[PDB]
Design a protein around this nucleic acid. Structure first.
Length: 131
DNA sequence: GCCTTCGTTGGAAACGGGATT
DNA sequence: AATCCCGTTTCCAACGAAGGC
């Protein structure tokens, strides 16, 4: 069968939002038509306006593909890890993948996440997620 | 009639860790 | 080492029924 729900990218939802703010004198149903989405869908996008724009910023160039702001159960660790290597890149230096995995396992120890393994799946997803 | 909210649940994307490039 | 794979699990978000203007 065909799809039953159309999922949109953060970039697409961002455009829809921007459309409504630049055309306050148009019927919401009119804007929904222009993007070919249920008025129901447009409303929920507008209500999540701030989260959506935050996600678009968060995913950066990946907003062109990312649709969901799903988090990893190790999200707290990912926050610390990012801040960490993002501070190294601020000095114009690259962060070796090997050092990244090492640092993640140490942060996990500190947080008490005994089940974190810095698994291949997790690392790959992180690399493509936080892109 | 227009538009949004509520609630259901479709489906994106998380997971581990062995397989593969 | 970095990626990919895949059976499974977890939970974000789309959209129709309802209901308030």
């Amino acid at each position: 069968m065909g799809p039953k729900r159309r999922q949109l990218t953060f970039r697409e939802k961002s455009r829809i939002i921007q459309e409504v703010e630049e055309n306050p004198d148009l019927r919401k149903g009119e804007i929904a038509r222009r993007f070919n989405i249920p008025p129901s869908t447009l409303s929920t996008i507008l209500k999540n306006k701030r989260a959506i724009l935050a996600s678009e910023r968060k995913y950066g160039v990946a907003s062109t593909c990312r649709k969901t702001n799903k988090l990893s159960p190790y999200d707290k660790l990912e926050g610390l890890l990012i801040a960490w290597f993002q501070q190294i890149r601020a000095a114009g230096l690259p962060v070796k993948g090997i050092i990244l995995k090492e640092k993640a396992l140490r942060i996990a120890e500190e947080l008490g996440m005994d089940d974190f393994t810095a698994s291949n799946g997790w690392l790959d997803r992180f690399r493509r997620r936080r892109s």
